[PDB]
Amino acid sequence: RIRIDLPQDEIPAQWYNILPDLPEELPPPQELLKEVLPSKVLELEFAKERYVKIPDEVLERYLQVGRPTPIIRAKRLEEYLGNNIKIYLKMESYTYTGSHKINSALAHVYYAKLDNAKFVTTETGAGQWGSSVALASALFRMKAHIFMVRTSYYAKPYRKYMMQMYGAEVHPSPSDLTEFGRQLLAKDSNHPGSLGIAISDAVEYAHKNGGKYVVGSVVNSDIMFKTIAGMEAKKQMELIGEDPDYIIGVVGGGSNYAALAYPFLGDELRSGKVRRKYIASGSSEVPKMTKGVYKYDYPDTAKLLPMLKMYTIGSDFVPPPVYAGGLRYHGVAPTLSLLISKGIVQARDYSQEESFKWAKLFSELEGYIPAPETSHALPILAEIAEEAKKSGERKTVLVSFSGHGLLDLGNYASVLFK
């Protein structure tokens, strides 16, 4: 009785755009950025329609990569927690790349191909985004050039290998394939690189060679594409007649959480009354959730995109080298930040020691190793268990289980196995 499957012939056929349903208007963002970006991707940012039809070509690849993903009920975790709540896991880890990121990668590549792009480029550090764009590129028969921070290129090889199995060309950055890259290599032939440097690398290469750049950021389009997870989950839960009392997840930039929660939150906002509790968490080592300044700031280190109004601890923030928690990003998506400032979504932060302890507990109890990023949601369940206990009612929790941790086992090892 623990897995709820949505047949592939019943997958949702539109994405959800919360913009029209926000309590107040979203604080507008503040080119080139138009030559390298897919035309429709630019269009969908300002979108005023509540829904965007998913192209049939995109929908077909969604099915190809494992969608719809199941909801799993974590009954053993429930028992451990005293059977005071019910825990439903939306398993985005079940996609072939093991995370929710392929949901927007497929759409970005599709719209690049529509623009008649000769290839797509993107930046990557740890390789989560890179491997997702690599798969999406392969499924559209699109040439992919991935610019990977040279340090990570050697340090975290398995995801490089994954990108290469998918047939992507992977370039250590700064690369000699661009002027901006060659100019840095003349300073240091083994220049360690940065995420910012790789964005500049990927952008210049698309710009100069008639390609398109695939943005993996907190832009409104990206969140919209990922809401296929929430669209599915809404249908699954209504299928077994359970309405969640809590929806929770973690915030890198916030796209995975929003993607799950927004379709539920949209219903409520349109009814005028928010009844559910929404709780998202990040890492206290990178505390933009709980200690962020709400202000206009650069969504990327390259200063490529215009500033967005978001919770941020600054685009130059770097985490301690001990941090293996994976939620390194400095800001929160503008829509989510707006929601947090209005008290609609509650913010939490946990240490990696606390989160990884829960990861370990979850792996032994339920049997599935969560991504280190995902592990930061688990401490929220303890807090919810207590409040439920004081309810007299059994509360239902829906969790964005954003990825598995098989390719992050080295991260866990560095904390858990000394």
Ligand X SMILES: Cc1ncc(COP(=O)(O)O)c(C)c1O
Ligand Y SMILES: Cc1ncc(COP(=O)(O)O)c(CN[C@@H](COP(=O)(O)O)C(=O)O)c1O
Residue of the chain from 124, 194, 284, 374 that contacts ligand X (CB under 6 A): 374
194 or 213, CB closer to ligand Y?
A: 213
Categorise residue 88: left if φ over 0, alpha if ψ from -120 to 50, beta otherwise: beta
Q: Out of ligand X, ligand Y, a second copy, none, which partner does residue 63 contact, by CB within 5 to 8 A per kind?
A: a second copy
Q: Which of 87, 57, 156, 130 is nearest to 358 (CA)?
A: 87
128 makes contact with ligand Y (CB under 6 A):
yes
47 or 365, CB closer to a second copy?
A: 365
Categorise residue 382: left if φ over 0, alpha if ψ from -120 to 50, beta otherwise: alpha
142 or 333, CB closer to ligand X?
A: 333
68 or 125, CB closer to ligand Y?
A: 125
The CA angle 220-224-228, to the nearest 5 degrees, is: 160
Mapped onto helix, strand or coil, the DSSP state of residue 221 is helix
Q: Which of 87, 106, 89 is nearest to 97 (CA)?
A: 106
Question: CA of 397: how far to CAs of 90, 237, 332, 379, in Å?
Answer: 10, 11, 23, 13
Residue of the chain from 230, 244, 334, 403 that contacts ligand Y (CB under 6 A): 403
Q: Out of ligand X, a second copy, ligand Y, none, which partner does residue 293 contact, by CB within 5 to 8 A per kind?
A: none
Q: Out of a second copy, ligand Y, ligand X, none, which partner does residue 127 contact, by CB within 5 to 8 A per kind?
A: ligand Y
Identify whether the C-beta of residue 389 lies closer than 8 Å to the C-beta of residue 237. Answer: no
98 or 334, CB closer to a second copy?
A: 98
Q: Out of a second copy, ligand Y, ligand X, none, which partner does residue 125 contact, by CB within 5 to 8 A per kind?
A: ligand Y
97 makes contact with ligand X (CB under 6 A):
no
103 or 194, CB closer to ligand Y?
A: 103
Contacts for 293-296 with beta carbons within 8 Å, 24 or more apart? Answer: 294/337, 294/341, 296/27, 296/30
The residue sitting closest to ligand Y, measured at its beta carbon, is 252
Distance CA 357, CA 109 (A): 37
Mapped onto helix, strand or coil, the DSSP state of residue 114 is helix
300 or 366, CB closer to a second copy?
A: 366
Q: Quick one: tokens of 188?
A: 């240091």
Footprint (CB under 6 A) of ligand Y, residues 257-296: 257
Site mask, a second copy, residues 120-159, x = CB under 8 A? ---------------x--xx-----------------xx-
Token look-up 């056929």 returns 13
**Helices and strands, number each (H, E), in the chain:** 18, 15
**Contacting residues toward a second copy, per CB under 8 A:** 1-3, 5, 7-9, 63-66, 76, 96, 98, 135, 138-139, 157-158, 161-162, 164-167, 359-360, 363-369, 406-407, 409-410, 412-413, 416-417
**Contacting residues toward ligand Y, per CB under 6 A:** 99, 124-129, 217, 250-257, 326-329, 371, 373-374, 402-403
